[PDB]
């Protein structure tokens, strides 16, 4: 519900001057927002739902191809007709033997021969369709207020904290008012219209791993297949069957079942999760505009923390160019702000580095309090630093 | 799974209001709608209204229009409603129930309910029973059996349950299924079938509790005085 | 009163097809897909059927939904006893904007069609107790069980006359052995109860009527 | 000479192709109001100024008074994605689509 630790992470300075900013939100992806005298905030798109797909067709990879039958016909005496071809219990084919007195027939020559195969699905490749009212999303907006390594994740604290929240938007309502309390409140536009991709791809249904297809290269294959019945058409692919058999036995060989076929076409279509009733969209996307000239900062009129500050461990790579550490403070005094920069050098006067978390501070009065942070260094070797003078501590940075 | 967890069993006077709540999980709380369906006792069901989490704006039954609140909190992905000057006829077990999965107000239907909570709205005056016991026969024969109980007379709302001796008597109870009076009071009947040939040597008691008045009785049942045998 | 018109009652036996029907108007069934519900008793409803023929998930193809005009109907195929609950028909309303019900059909799965056999109520009746007629009050209690199908009607009479007035009976009820029960309470006053010979409780069941009767210096 | 509809939009459906580079649809008013014009147009994309979408059913409005009236909509949005829009601000509803 916040972006620390995902890796579709964007960081956003809106513009200058700007109380708002324009964005864009996707499955998995987070951003962190930034503004001039204000909080920091992650907005996140959660969850893409429809709040009733069908299916369309419906090809196999198959076996029952177990019994067999060979109507027999003599030479001259015409056709066979096979009394397995009155229902569809067996696929049968004619053909033509070589034969005579030397196989019980009376003249010489080709006989005819109507031979059946049973016809039933085991693994059926499925798909279906996505109609384009119903469509909801579900933002989740956090605030870079006092947080720990421990809370920062967790959305409850953070709900509790008043520094979180979970809401909808929809056709309906594109917009929402999220209220933070003294933190004042941000207010989306989202505009629902995404890409996206039009509804023209199928839905491909493999087993488990769900896919999206083509229209055409699903519709367009060759395998058997069956649209809402539990009749199948096209069984043919229970070939391999014509040795061009004697009148006794037409080897009936189930037509090994190569799931390369499909899996060869994998790349071409796009994979996705899908439940029994339920296709999340990633693939899908979301156009925003996050106004928040109602966002404010909070604690501005405490004092600066003054006692000593410890680390608590190497500052972390979040593979953004920033880096997390959590502090502890020796402080038995409340909350204060907390005093860290980034300085280039040991004893500069101007900071370098640019903190995510901004205006930071002890939330608590209870001494040893802990404190996480992220900030972006600046690039090659660099300090982090938090008080002053002889309570100043430090600790050295490379960023590349 | 979607799963809609409701609070217990209420029972209220007339005039008096009620509140009643569905907890939500297994699905995006605020991406569905959530109705409310009420069913009073052997009756059909009877739409509410409806209420969107995303935002809290709701459309309620013309007929409850103006006692009907719905409400929502995201955080703990609750709904809330409330009937305000209740009346016997509000009766119902009540149900929330999460849409189908409606992108408007327009088509919308319930599809995944709740287990409801009944409430009773009684006086109307709370009243505890009355409790009288039933004598068994003072027919004697062998391997005869006899039917004995308690009548609980007159009480309101619902419910009220009957044990015997201490739950330690359980073969051959039979509580039946109260009667509503056109009082507006109810009253139930238990009755146990035991050998005759041992009435007035084993104890008999009924132990009724109506828990909405706090009244508990526990009421011996005893061999009629005329019986000469037991 | 509900908006949408359904049969209070079905029946059928075991394996038969049954039809429950849905009657409504052009605002709700002509414009709109009707949806249908069955609870099953001590139950929530669950949706049965969607979109005037669709099946949810689990739904087995023997439920079966149609619309024409301005009615539905459900038809359920190859009637099974856990089919035995109240199944609701459903609607968008057009004019109310908002959905409607209709009032509900009981369904009842009958014994076997060659033979569920009938059970005869077994009746007791126990007069006012000492302790109740002390409190200047008197309640005959007559307690009805076992009988199938579970359909009964009370009659009480004083000496040989009916009486009606102070007659309270409950809706049967379905037992643990899948037989069903009943109870009829008659209110009286003390005076009343000693100034006839004898009161009944008369019970018929498929036309068989079984009696009981308690007087009021007897020793039964 | 009457005013524009000012009250609630909903759609009754997914607009249809008609085949002919136009979609057909239908809307339902909250409305209680009378005759008032149906605020309907086709924008690129959400909250633009100007239209993109010609109406064929030019100048639609609620025929009737009577609350929960239904329109019947056809026009011709542009190619490629478009939103179709009816009411505004707040009101506003909305529906997208792509032509090719």
Request: with cysteine; hydrophobic share 30%; proline share 5%.
């Given at each position: 519900?916040?972006?620390?630790?995902?890796?579709?992470?964007?960081?956003?300075?809106?513009?200058?001057?700007?109380?708002?900013?324009?964005?864009?939100?996707?499955?998995?992806?987070?951003?962190?927002?930034?503004?001039?005298?204000?909080?920091?905030?992650?907005?996140?798109?959660?969850?893409?739902?429809?709040?009733?797909?069908?299916?369309?067709?419906?090809?196999?990879?198959?076996?029952?191809?177990?019994?067999?039958?060979?109507?027999?016909?003599?030479?001259?005496?015409?056709?066979?007709?096979?009394?397995?071809?009155?229902?569809?219990?067996?696929?049968?084919?004619?053909?033509?033997?070589?034969?005579?007195?030397?196989?019980?027939?009376?003249?010489?020559?080709?006989?005819?021969?109507?031979?059946?195969?049973?016809?039933?699905?085991?693994?059926?490749?499925?798909?279906?369709?996505?109609?384009?009212?119903?469509?909801?999303?579900?933002?989740?907006?956090?605030?870079?207020?006092?947080?720990?390594?421990?809370?920062?994740?967790?959305?409850?604290?953070?709900?509790?904290?008043?520094?979180?929240?979970?809401?909808?938007?929809?056709?309906?309502?594109?917009?929402?008012?999220?209220?933070?309390?003294?933190?004042?409140?941000?207010?989306?536009?989202?505009?629902?219209?995404?890409?996206?991709?039009?509804?023209?791809?199928?839905?491909?249904?493999?087993?488990?791993?769900?896919?999206?297809?083509?229209?055409?290269?699903?519709?367009?294959?060759?395998?058997?297949?069956?649209?809402?019945?539990?009749?199948?058409?096209?069984?043919?692919?229970?070939?391999?069957?014509?040795?061009?058999?004697?009148?006794?036995?037409?080897?009936?060989?189930?037509?090994?079942?190569?799931?390369?076929?499909?899996?060869?076409?994998?790349?071409?279509?796009?994979?996705?999760?899908?439940?029994?009733?339920?296709?999340?969209?990633?693939?899908?996307?979301?156009?925003?505009?996050?106004?928040?000239?109602?966002?404010?900062?909070?604690?501005?009129?405490?004092?600066?923390?003054?006692?000593?500050?410890?680390?608590?461990?190497?500052?972390?790579?979040?593979?953004?160019?920033?880096?997390?550490?959590?502090?502890?403070?020796?402080?038995?005094?409340?909350?204060?702000?907390?005093?860290?920069?980034?300085?280039?050098?040991?004893?500069?006067?101007?900071?370098?580095?640019?903190?995510?978390?901004?205006?930071?501070?002890?939330?608590?009065?209870?001494?040893?309090?802990?404190?996480?942070?992220?900030?972006?260094?600046?690039?090659?070797?660099?300090?982090?630093?938090?008080?002053?003078?002889?309570?100043?501590?430090?600790?050295?940075?490379?960023?590349? | 799974?979607?799963?809609?967890?409701?609070?217990?069993?209420?029972?209220?006077?007339?005039?008096?209001?009620?509140?009643?709540?569905?907890?939500?999980?297994?699905?995006?709380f605020t991406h569905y709608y959530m109705h409310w369906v009420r069913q009073a006792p052997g009756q059909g069901l009877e739409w509410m209204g409806i209420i969107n989490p995303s935002g809290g704006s709701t459309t309620y039954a013309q007929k409850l229009q103006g006692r009907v609140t719905m409400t929502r909190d995201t955080s703990?992905?609750?709904?809330?409603?409330?009937?305000?000057?209740?009346?016997?006829?509000?009766?119902?077990?009540?149900?929330?129930?999460?849409?189908?999965?409606?992108?408007?107000?327009?088509?919308?239907?319930?599809?995944?309910?709740?287990?409801?909570?009944?409430?009773?709205?009684?006086?109307?005056?709370?009243?505890?029973?009355?409790?009288?016991?039933?004598?068994?026969?003072?027919?004697?024969?062998?391997?005869?059996?006899?039917?004995?109980?308690?009548?609980?007379?007159?009480?309101?709302?619902?419910?009220?349950?009957?044990?015997?001796?201490?739950?330690?008597?359980?073969?051959?109870?039979?509580?039946?299924?109260?009667?509503?009076?056109?009082?507006?009071?109810?009253?139930?009947?238990?009755?146990?079938?035991?050998?005759?040939?041992?009435?007035?040597?084993?104890?008999?008691?009924?132990?009724?509790?109506?828990?909405?008045?706090?009244?508990?009785?526990?009421?011996?049942?005893?061999?009629?005085?005329?019986?000469?045998?037991? | 009163?509900?908006?949408?018109?359904?049969?209070?009652?079905?029946?059928?036996?075991?394996?038969?097809?049954?039809?429950?029907?849905?009657?409504?108007?052009?605002?709700?069934?002509?414009?709109?897909?009707?949806?249908?519900?069955?609870?099953?008793?001590?139950?929530?409803?669950?949706?049965?059927?969607?979109?005037?023929?669709?099946?949810?998930?689990?739904?087995?193809?023997?439920?079966?939904?149609?619309?024409?005009?301005?009615?539905?109907?459900?038809?359920?195929?190859?009637?099974?006893?856990?089919?035995?609950?109240?199944?609701?028909?459903?609607?968008?309303?057009?004019?109310?904007?908002?959905?409607?019900?209709?009032?509900?059909?009981?369904?009842?799965?009958?014994?076997?069609?060659?033979?569920?056999?009938?059970?005869?109520?077994?009746?007791?009746?126990?007069?006012?107790?000492?302790?109740?007629?002390?409190?200047?009050?008197?309640?005959?209690?007559?307690?009805?069980?076992?009988?199938?199908?579970?359909?009964?009607?009370?009659?009480?009479?004083?000496?040989?006359?009916?009486?009606?007035?102070?007659?309270?009976?409950?809706?049967?009820?379905?037992?643990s052995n899948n037989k069903y029960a009943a109870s009829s309470y008659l209110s009286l006053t003390p005076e009343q109860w000693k100034s006839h010979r004898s009161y009944s409780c008369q019970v018929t069941h498929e036309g068989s009527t079984v009696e009981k009767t308690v007087a009021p210096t007897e020793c039964s």
């Amino acid at each position: 519900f916040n972006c620390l630790g995902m890796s579709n992470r964007d960081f956003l300075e809106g513009v200058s001057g700007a109380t708002w900013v324009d964005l864009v939100l996707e499955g998995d992806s987070c951003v962190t927002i930034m503004s001039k005298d204000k909080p920091t905030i992650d907005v996140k798109m959660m969850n893409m739902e429809a709040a009733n797909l069908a299916e369309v067709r419906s090809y196999c990879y198959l076996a029952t191809v177990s019994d067999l039958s060979t109507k027999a016909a003599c030479p001259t005496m015409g056709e066979a007709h096979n009394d397995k071809r009155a229902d569809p219990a067996f696929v049968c084919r004619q053909g033509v033997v070589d034969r005579g007195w030397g196989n019980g027939c009376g003249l010489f020559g080709k006989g005819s021969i109507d031979t059946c195969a049973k016809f039933a699905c085991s693994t059926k490749a499925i798909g279906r369709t996505i109609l384009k009212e119903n469509i909801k999303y579900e933002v989740a907006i956090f605030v870079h207020g006092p947080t720990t390594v421990e809370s920062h994740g967790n959305y409850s604290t953070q709900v509790g904290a008043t520094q979180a929240g979970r809401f909808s938007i929809t056709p309906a309502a594109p917009s929402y008012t999220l209220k933070l309390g003294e933190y004042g409140e941000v207010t989306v536009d989202c505009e629902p219209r995404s890409g996206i991709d039009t509804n023209a791809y199928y839905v491909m249904t493999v087993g488990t791993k769900t896919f999206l297809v083509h229209r055409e290269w699903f519709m367009d294959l060759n395998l058997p297949w069956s649209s809402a019945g539990s009749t199948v058409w096209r069984n043919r692919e229970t070939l391999m069957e014509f040795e061009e058999p004697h009148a006794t036995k037409q080897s009936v060989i189930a037509l090994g079942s190569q799931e390369g076929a499909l899996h060869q076409a994998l790349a071409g279509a796009i994979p996705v999760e899908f439940s029994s009733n339920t296709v999340k969209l990633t693939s899908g996307h979301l156009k925003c505009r996050v106004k928040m000239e109602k966002l404010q900062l909070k604690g501005t009129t405490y004092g600066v923390c003054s006692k000593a500050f410890k680390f608590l461990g190497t500052p972390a790579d979040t593979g953004h160019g920033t880096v997390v550490l959590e502090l502890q403070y020796t402080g038995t005094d409340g909350p204060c702000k907390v005093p860290i920069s980034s300085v280039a050098s040991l004893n500069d006067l101007t900071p370098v580095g640019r903190l995510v978390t901004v205006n930071p501070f002890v939330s608590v009065a209870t001494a040893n309090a802990k404190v996480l942070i992220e900030l972006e260094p600046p690039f090659g070797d660099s300090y982090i630093v938090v008080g002053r003078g002889e309570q100043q501590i430090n600790h050295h940075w490379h960023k590349s | 799974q979607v799963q809609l967890v409701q609070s217990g069993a209420e029972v209220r006077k007339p005039g008096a209001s009620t509140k009643v709540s569905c907890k939500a999980s297994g699905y995006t709380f605020t991406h569905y709608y959530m109705h409310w369906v009420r069913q009073a006792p052997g009756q059909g069901l009877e739409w509410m209204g409806i209420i969107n989490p995303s935002g809290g704006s709701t459309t309620y039954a013309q007929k409850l229009q103006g006692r009907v609140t719905m409400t929502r909190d995201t955080s703990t992905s609750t709904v809330y409603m409330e009937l305000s000057s209740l009346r016997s006829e509000d009766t119902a077990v009540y149900y929330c129930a999460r849409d189908w999965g409606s992108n408007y107000v327009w088509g919308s239907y319930p599809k995944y309910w709740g287990q409801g909570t009944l409430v009773t709205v009684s006086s109307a005056s709370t009243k505890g029973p009355s409790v009288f016991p039933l004598a068994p026969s003072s027919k004697s024969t062998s391997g005869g059996t006899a039917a004995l109980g308690c009548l609980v007379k007159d009480y309101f709302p619902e419910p009220v349950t009957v044990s015997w001796n201490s739950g330690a008597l359980t073969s051959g109870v039979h509580t039946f299924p109260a009667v509503l009076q056109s009082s507006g009071l109810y009253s139930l009947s238990s009755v146990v079938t035991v050998p005759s040939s041992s009435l007035g040597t084993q104890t008999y008691i009924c132990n009724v509790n109506h828990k909405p008045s706090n009244t508990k009785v526990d009421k011996r049942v005893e061999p009629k005085s005329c019986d000469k045998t037991h | 009163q509900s908006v949408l018109t359904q049969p209070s009652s079905v029946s059928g036996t075991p394996g038969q097809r049954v039809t429950i029907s849905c009657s409504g108007s052009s605002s709700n069934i002509g414009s709109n897909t009707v949806n249908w519900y069955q609870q099953l008793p001590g139950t929530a409803p669950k949706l049965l059927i969607y979109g005037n023929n669709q099946r949810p998930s689990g739904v087995p193809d023997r439920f079966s939904g149609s619309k024409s005009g301005t009615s539905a109907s459900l038809a359920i195929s190859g009637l099974q006893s856990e089919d035995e609950a109240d199944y609701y028909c459903a609607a968008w309303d057009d004019s109310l904007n908002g959905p409607v019900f209709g009032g509900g059909t009981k369904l009842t799965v009958l014994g076997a069609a060659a033979g569920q056999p009938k059970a005869a109520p077994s009746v007791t009746l126990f007069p006012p107790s000492s302790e109740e007629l002390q409190a200047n009050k008197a309640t005959l209690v007559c307690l009805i069980s076992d009988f199938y199908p579970g359909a009964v009607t009370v009659a009480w009479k004083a000496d040989s006359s009916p009486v009606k007035a102070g007659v309270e009976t409950t809706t049967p009820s379905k037992q643990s052995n899948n037989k069903y029960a009943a109870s009829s309470y008659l209110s009286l006053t003390p005076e009343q109860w000693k100034s006839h010979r004898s009161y009944s409780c008369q019970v018929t069941h498929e036309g068989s009527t079984v009696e009981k009767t308690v007087a009021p210096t007897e020793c039964s």
